[PDB]
Design a protein around this nucleic acid. Structure first.
Ligand SMILES: Nc1nc2c(ncn2[C@@H]2O[C@H](COP(=O)(O)OP(=O)(O)O)[C@@H](O)[C@H]2O)c(=O)[nH]1
Ligand SMILES: [Mg+2]
Ligand SMILES: [Mg+2]
Ligand SMILES: [Mg+2]
Ligand SMILES: [Mg+2]
Ligand SMILES: [Mg+2]
Ligand SMILES: [Mg+2]
Ligand SMILES: [Mg+2]
Ligand SMILES: [Mg+2]
Ligand SMILES: [Mg+2]
Ligand SMILES: [Mg+2]
Ligand SMILES: [Mg+2]
Ligand SMILES: [Mg+2]
Ligand SMILES: [Mg+2]
Ligand SMILES: [Mg+2]
Ligand SMILES: [Mg+2]
Ligand SMILES: [Mg+2]
Ligand SMILES: [Mg+2]
Ligand SMILES: [Mg+2]
Ligand SMILES: [Mg+2]
Ligand SMILES: [Mg+2]
Ligand SMILES: [Mg+2]
Ligand SMILES: [Mg+2]
Ligand SMILES: [Mg+2]
Ligand SMILES: [Mg+2]
Ligand SMILES: [Mg+2]
Ligand SMILES: [Mg+2]
Ligand SMILES: [Mg+2]
Ligand SMILES: [Mg+2]
Lengths: 82, 62, 205, 703, 85
RNA sequence: AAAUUGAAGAGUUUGAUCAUGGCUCAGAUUGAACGCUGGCGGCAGGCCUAACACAUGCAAGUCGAACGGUAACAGGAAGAAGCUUGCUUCUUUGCUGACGAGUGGCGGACGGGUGAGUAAUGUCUGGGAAACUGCCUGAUGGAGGGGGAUAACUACUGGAAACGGUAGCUAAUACCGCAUAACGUCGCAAGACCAAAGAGGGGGACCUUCGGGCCUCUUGCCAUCGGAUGUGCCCAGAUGGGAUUAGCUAGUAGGUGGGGUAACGGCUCACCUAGGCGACGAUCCCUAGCUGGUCUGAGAGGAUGACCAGCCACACUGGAACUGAGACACGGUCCAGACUCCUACGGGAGGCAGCAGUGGGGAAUAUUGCACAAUGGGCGCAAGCCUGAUGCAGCCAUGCCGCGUGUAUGAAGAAGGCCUUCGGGUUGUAAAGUACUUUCAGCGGGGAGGAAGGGAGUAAAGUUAAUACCUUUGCUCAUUGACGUUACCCGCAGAAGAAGCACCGGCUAACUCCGUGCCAGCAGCCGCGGUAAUACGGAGGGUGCAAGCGUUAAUCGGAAUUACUGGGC
């Protein structure tokens, strides 16, 4: 269960997540295998809100990595199909 | 250890508890510490109006 | 975080005029500018290197209405930024919102400019900003807000902002009560009596 | 949600003289309600109410202990009513505990020894219950003791306390042959079983040994009930015997409105009469809902600021009556919720200090045992943890609830001692302990008197104070030694007037300044001024410079302020600078202060004035049988008397006594008046007193 | 205990009983093989080896021992039998 | 593109000088404390000492889609309560939703805490071979058939409780042998040998003992090979002080064979060899978690390892093993030790170095808080439950940052204070007065964003045989925020609710008077005070900083004063 999940860095009342492929046992902010993109839920301007490293995420999914619900939704939004 | 009692007039008896800070008197050879006034029932200097934060003296109404 | 006190004491302790009063009357008519505030102001003790450096730094601080913590931060930013540290420090001090407000008008003194800024009566680049130290960037439009124009202090300060050198980096629209900040002021665009190197060496001391 | 209906709640206290049987009756109540699997006995320390170590060791209750029991009846007659009982201490040295509880309780079982009957502390708790206007029943315990006389004790209740007691359960057999009780409504004789611990009993048919006395007192009970309402009176006079239900209802109305006290009998230690007393409680005493709604104030009063029904529909209101120490959370507040509902973790307002408090935990009490409960309803006693500044009598409620209730008065402590730790590395710890103890107990104060470094401990009695001292030693351990409070004297001149001088050789040719003063001191009269210092300006010969001609009295203030004789102050002195010398350039006030000090010293030396001890006025109320004894004690003490008065219920003596003396006067007064006399103090103007300690204290330090 | 790890305590007790029984059964069969090896009778040693082989294989499959442990037993005992000549 | 632009000195030995050499000071930093004072907001930090002892409440559960089943609730059915043949609910039926306890699966070895131990059994850097790895994922297969239990439960019964005893059975995705299994284990080969578990949704046929079989779909099961992840192991270097510690080691160093490990190995054993380590510091003693980093410095360096992240070690102390993929397991077992608690006296229970909190110690470090709404974790097909992880709230000026406490005008240069040469100077445009503004705080009204998802319906294709069930994707529908009376915005008012601390002899910026007179006292260093003290104390005035300031403690710098850069005899 090598999950791809959101790390919740940032500040108080101003979250900002790192999309990290991390072994599921480790803590949210703790050990991870690599970081593949980021996400900013409060980015509400011309600036980019999220970025994902799609080919690396696909590589890890092929390797068997699990995807979190939010990572899946954000990948859906990144792809123009949604 | 031996410690100085700065200021004019104190109330330190033979068993009063007090607070000790660093320092020295430099003409009492052997006193290398100072008694913090206005801390641990060492009352602040009486009728003091300048350097009043040292000597543990509170702000008068004035 | 503001010096609430007499201002002409500061002006005559620094000697020259710090522009801490309006142009309603003369500084020499408002105070005995020649001597110092104290009862021992007649005497003129010999100054030292540290004395002149401190006096220059305090002159700049009192000119711009800034305290030592923020001024040290400004010096750190200037030393970080490439170029002359003194010129960078002076440009950073001219970038302050109250500073540009005063230099454009809208206030007869920088404390008046600070009230105008803090009272949400100033709008910078469309956004309402009420921070006196808000650093204005090149090509920024600093404008008065509605429901604050035409009042006595504003109109008096705009009119009084004449009879003085026009800054060559603002291009203010006095009638409509906004100005621009096209680019940072250069060394030649300022008093030129203030030795910035004295402040630089004081803070490198 | 509500485990028991509002009507089936009985908040009662057990109040009486010392060792009347309160704790034993509580233990038998717990046994017969099943919460306690062993009866135990107090003198062996097995009583559950006597949970503190002092109570276990000494056989006495020192704290008001609240617990709860479920009672159906002797014959399981009713659905289980929940009785919230509080066992109160009958010691006169713990009166705040009984007053504290009795404020919040709805009823009182007053226990009376069959032998002694009405006793001094029975009368004390009677007065407390009367001022709180609470319904009472009576339990004549100790019926197994030789000399027991139930009828005589009832007559003592009638004559002494001022009641009109109504017999309800007469006694079968002699003292040691205490078989059981005949009820004056059922006409049944309950005889308890001796093989087991009185759990079982049998109803018998009132044998011939007593059928006339029982019949007469049953007729008296019937007519007493009939004297409650005209609907009862008319049928009684028409001549049909009242039905038992209507008799009980009328007697209940009389109990609520305090026309009568229903007196039963029993023997708790021999396991008899307790279940009958419990049924008397259920049948005759009120519930939280069977009284008119409580009242308070709101915003300087109104037509009716508060009328809070005993129901859950209304905003929460309560009263935090007891505050108790906890070594592990620092506090535990026993409160009765008068109206509404509260839950664990909810926030409320203390209407007195006007601050928010969060109920960290709410628990139900069984002696020292605490059981967590999610919520508390109206008419229920519980304990809160998480309160941190609430005191006794504080109202805790939702917003817009009554502010001040009747609980704003406490007795005044009488005994005073000076407590000092054995180890003087213990001052702060002992002071903290005493401060928290004072916070729990309003009638106990601790204060550091500022004339000395001692710390004075004031309590309701010697038993109260040594209980406080040894409990301080045990819990939050700090040792302590008791002593005597020090004495603050004052001086006065014995009509001496002179033109005394003061002159110090400060000039010496080169010092550049000096001065000289010439003053007069006079005593005005013993206590005609609120300002002990006096001044009348007469500086004429060489009038000093004008900037402080009138200000040469604030500087002389300090000589009178402390220590002309033995470090003590003075009253009635008046200073008069008549003459002096100076130079009219710089009259240094600091340099003139040395002249003032020397003038004061020479003046005292020439005066040879003497000391006034602190003599206060003591006003004592005592019965009119120990008047001679108490005034003889006051006369053996070097004290004077003032005024003769004869109260209807006693005699009031007034006297003047020193402060060094009358140390522990309350215990001596109680000894010589059977603990049935009170005294108050008000610190009248001083008087001369020959004491060899006045010169001792100053000559201990040589010259 | 506080939580319901007492259930796992009971389960571990039962599994200890079961595993101890099966493991001791394994070990006594292996002891039979080794005793036959010490005796030198290759016929009885080979028979004991053939009887314990299903035992160790099945217990390794069930998880009481590991495949490496079972293979180690088989290889060592086969080597002993081969040198028994 | 830019990743850096960086190095200051002064006081003090002397009558004076120069060198040398210490001491002290000017800077930055704090997990700081103390004194005085204190308005708000944002973001961080918050027992450095007693790994000292711990009350109380929570910190790990979930699955009924594995099973027997029915303790509580609900729904139906079968009726001589209610009853105007019932709307007003007495009882029965696991029958259905659901579900306490029980067996069973997974989790509980994660997450959280502490640094006591550990000076090389560790950590960092760089490699290596003899390994295993639940869950996740890819490939290929199998998934006949049978057995005996036993929990729960029933009966009796012990016990205060904790918890059990004696029989009777009843289930399984519990356990057990057989059938079968090979690119799998053993063997050179021949050959020998090893597994399983079933469950749920819907369904036109067709067969039923209204149990379903049977056809599908989705899950789970078992064998092997992989991948990824994680873990184990080995090697080289580096990683403190002491020689006022020069010898240490006998499973000790190596070899052969047996055993053991998941794996190589003295890991263990039986023998044989007499070795191995050490002046490049073994052994012994003291100390200590290590690191990325943090502070300082121009660098080299020095000091340090709070927060955050990685690894290690520990869990009341010592030892041991069980289960499991993984432990020798904070919230598991057993034993031994001390402590604590309940006991009905016969027995029984516990380990805050999890979140709070209490006592103690200390100069000193917080709430016995709200939610699982975000993100993660466990379980489950999901819904959903749990989560003291986590997100927030509270307290503390503990730190960094921002803002405010008014702005302009105002000469009777008012009064009062202080000084004075008695003219005046100064407090000082300061105040008062006049006009103006209302940030922030205080009230009243609007108001995002953190919210993605999930549920129900329907359309599409996919599936199948079945436009059914089940996935995947559109379309809508009412919805989910503790923080929260949120951020943010608008209105009322009146300068109102908001300035103190240190210093003023030289170093060091800011000087006069008075009272005391080597006394009282000050002092970072030099030093001041014995009759005109800018060095003490008060006043006035000024200087520096400012919701802070100062005092004390600690690191570095200055100190080229441990000099490798960069010193001397
Ligand atoms: N003989 C007898 N002794 C009694 C009775 N009630 C209480 N006692 C005993 O008298 C002593 C005091 O009674 P206790 O219950 O402690 O009463 P309290 O001190 O007033 O609360 C104890 O030793 C009791 O056991 C009674 O009815 N008869
Ligand atoms: Mg600030
Ligand atoms: Mg008693
Ligand atoms: Mg007694
Ligand atoms: Mg081998
Ligand atoms: Mg502990
Ligand atoms: Mg919880
Ligand atoms: Mg269940
Ligand atoms: Mg069976
Ligand atoms: Mg199985
Ligand atoms: Mg060594
Ligand atoms: Mg250590
Ligand atoms: Mg250097
Ligand atoms: Mg820590
Ligand atoms: Mg094991
Ligand atoms: Mg564990
Ligand atoms: Mg624990
Ligand atoms: Mg302490
Ligand atoms: Mg979740
Ligand atoms: Mg004047
Ligand atoms: Mg506001
Ligand atoms: Mg939304
Ligand atoms: Mg929203
Ligand atoms: Mg100077
Ligand atoms: Mg000083
Ligand atoms: Mg210093
Ligand atoms: Mg003088
Ligand atoms: Mg160096
Ligand atoms: Mg040298």
């Amino acid at each position: 269960m090598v999950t791809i999940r959101l790390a919740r860095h940032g500040a108080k009342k101003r979250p900002f997540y790192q999309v990290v492929v991390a072994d599921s046992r480790n803590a949210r902010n703790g050990r991870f295998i690599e970081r593949v993109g980021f996400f900013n839920p409060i980015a509400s301007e011309k600036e980019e809100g999220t970025r994902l490293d799609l080919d690396r995420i696909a590589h890890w999914v092929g390797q068997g990595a699990t995807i979190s619900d939010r990572v899946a939704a954000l990948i859906k939004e990144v792809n123009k199909a949604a | 250890v031996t410690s100085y009692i700065g200021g004019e007039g104190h109330n330190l008896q033979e068993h009063s508890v007090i607070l000790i800070r660093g320092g020295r008197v430099k003409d009492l050879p052997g006193v290398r510490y100072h008694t913090v006034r206005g801390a641990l029932d060492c009352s602040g200097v009486k009728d003091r109006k300048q350097a009043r934060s040292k000597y543990g003296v509170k702000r008068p109404k004035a | 975080a503001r010096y609430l006190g007499p201002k002409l004491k500061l002006s005559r302790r620094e000697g020259t005029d710090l522009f801490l009063k309006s142009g309603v009357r003369a500084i020499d008519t408002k105070c005995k500018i020649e001597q110092a505030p104290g009862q021992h102001g007649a005497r003129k003790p010999r100054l030292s290197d540290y004395g002149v450096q401190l006096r220059e730094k305090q002159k700049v601080r009192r000119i711009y209405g800034v305290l030592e913590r923020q001024f040290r931060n400004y010096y750190k930013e200037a030393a970080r930024l490439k170029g002359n540290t003194g010129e960078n420090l002076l440009a950073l001090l001219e970038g302050r919102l109250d500073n540009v407000v005063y230099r454009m008008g809208f206030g007869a003194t920088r404390a008046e400019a600070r009230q105008l800024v803090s009272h949400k009566a100033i709008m910078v680049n469309g956004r309402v900003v009420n921070i006196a130290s808000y650093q204005v960037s090149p090509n920024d439009v600093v404008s008065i807000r509605e429901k604050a124009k035409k009042q006595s202090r504003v109109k008096a300060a705009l009119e009084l902002a004449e009879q003085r050198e026009k800054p060559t980096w603002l291009e203010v629209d006095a009638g409509k009560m906004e100005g621009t900040f096209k680019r940072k002021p250069e060394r030649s665009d300022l008093s030129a009596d203030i030795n910035e190197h004295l402040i630089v060496e004081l803070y490198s001391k | 949600a509500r485990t028991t209906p509002i009507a089936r709640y009985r908040n009662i206290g057990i109040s009486a003289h010392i060792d009347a049987g309160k704790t034993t009756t509580t233990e038998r109540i717990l046994f017969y309600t099943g919460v306690n699997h062993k009866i135990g006995e107090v003198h062996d320390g097995a009583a559950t109410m006597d949970w503190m170590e002092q109570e276990q060791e000494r056989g006495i209750t020192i704290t008001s202990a609240a617990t709860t029991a479920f009672w159906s009846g002797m014959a399981k007659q009713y659905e289980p009513h929940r009785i919230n009982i509080i066992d109160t201490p009958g010691h006169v040295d713990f009166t705040i505990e009984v007053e504290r509880s009795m404020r919040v309780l709805d009823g009182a079982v007053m226990v009376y020894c069959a032998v002694g009957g009405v006793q001094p502390q029975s009368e004390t708790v009677w007065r407390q219950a009367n001022k709180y206007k609470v319904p009472r029943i009576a339990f004549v315990n100790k019926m197994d003791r030789m000399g027991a006389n139930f009828l005589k004790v009832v007559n003592q209740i009638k004559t002494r306390l001022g009641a009109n007691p109504v017999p309800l359960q007469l006694a079968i057999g002699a003292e040691e042959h205490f078989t059981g009780v005949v009820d004056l409504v059922k006409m049944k004789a309950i005889n308890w079983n001796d093989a087991d611990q009185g759990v079982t009993f049998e109803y018998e048919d009132i044998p011939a040994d007593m059928v006339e006395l029982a019949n007469e007192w049953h007729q008296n009970l019937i007519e007493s009930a009939a004297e409650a309402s005209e609907e009862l009176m008319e049928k009684y006079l028409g001549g049909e015997e009242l039905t038992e239900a209507e008799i009980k209802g009328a007697l209940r109305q009389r109990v609520l409105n305090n026309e009568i006290i229903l007196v039963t009998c029993g023997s708790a230690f021999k396991n008899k009469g307790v279940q009958a007393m419990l049924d008397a409680v259920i049948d005759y005493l009120p519930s939280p809902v069977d009284v008119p709604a409580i009242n308070g104030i709101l915003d300087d009063g109104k037509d009716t600021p508060a009328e809070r029904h005993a129901s859950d529909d209304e905003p929460f209101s309560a009263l935090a009556f007891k505050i108790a120490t906890d070594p592990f959370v620092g506090n535990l507040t026993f409160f009765r919720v008068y109206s509404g509902v509260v839950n664990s973790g909810d926030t409320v307002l203390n209407s007195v200090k006007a601050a928010r408090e969060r109920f960290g935990r709410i628990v139900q009490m069984h002696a020292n045992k605490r059981e967590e409960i999610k919520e508390v309803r109206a008419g229920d006693i519980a304990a809160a943890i998480g309160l941190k500044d609430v005191t006794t009598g504080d109202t805790l409620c939702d917003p817009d609830a009554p502010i001040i209730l009747e609980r704003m008065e406490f007795p005044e402590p009488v005994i005073s001692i000076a407590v000092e730790p054995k180890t003087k590395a213990d001052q702060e710890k002992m002071g903290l302990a005493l401060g928290r103890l004072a916070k729990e107990d309003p009638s106990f104060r601790v204060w550091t008197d500022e004339e000395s470094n001692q710390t004075i401990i004031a309590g309701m009695g010697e038993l109260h104070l040594d209980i406080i001292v040894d409990r301080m030693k045990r819990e939050f351990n700090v040792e302590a030694n008791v002593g005597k409070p020090q004495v603050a004297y004052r001086e006065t001149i014995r009509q001496k007037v002179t033109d005394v001088e003061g002159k110090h050789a400060k000039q010496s040719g080169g010092r550049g300044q000096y001065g000289h003063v010439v003053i007069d001191m006079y005593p005005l009269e013993p206590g005609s001024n609120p300002k002990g210092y006096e001044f009348i300006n007469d500086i004429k010969g060489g009038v000093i410079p004008g900037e402080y001609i009138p200000a040469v009295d604030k500087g002389i203030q300090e000589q009178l302020k402390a220590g002309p004789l033995a470090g003590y102050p003075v009253v009635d002195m008046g200073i008069r600078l008549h003459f002096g010398s100076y130079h009219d350039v710089d009259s240094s006030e600091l340099a003139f202060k040395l002249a003032a000090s020397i003038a004061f010293k020479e003046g005292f030396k020439k005066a040879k004035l003497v000391l006034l001890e602190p003599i206060m006025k003591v006003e004592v109320e005592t019965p009119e049988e120990n008047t001679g004894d108490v005034i003889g004690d006051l006369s053996r003490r070097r004290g004077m008397l003032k005024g003769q008065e004869s109260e209807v219920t006693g005699v009031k003596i007034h006297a003047e006594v020193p402060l060094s003396e009358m140390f522990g006067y309350a215990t001596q007064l109680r000894s010589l008046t059977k603990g049935r006399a009170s005294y108050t103090m008000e610190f009248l103007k001083y008087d001369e007193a020959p004491s060899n300690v006045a010169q001792a204290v100053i000559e201990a330090r040589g010259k | 205990n506080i939580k319901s790890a007492k259930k796992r305590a009971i389960q571990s007790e039962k599994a200890r009983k079961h595993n101890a029984s099966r493991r001791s059964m394994m070990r006594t069969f292996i002891k039979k093989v080794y005793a036959a090896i010490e005796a030198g009778d290759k016929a009885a040693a080979q028979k004991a080896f053939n009887e314990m082989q299903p035992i160790v294989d099945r217990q390794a499959a069930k998880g009481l021992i590991h495949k490496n442990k079972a293979a180690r037993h088989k290889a060592n005992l086969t080597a002993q039998i081969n040198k028994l000549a």
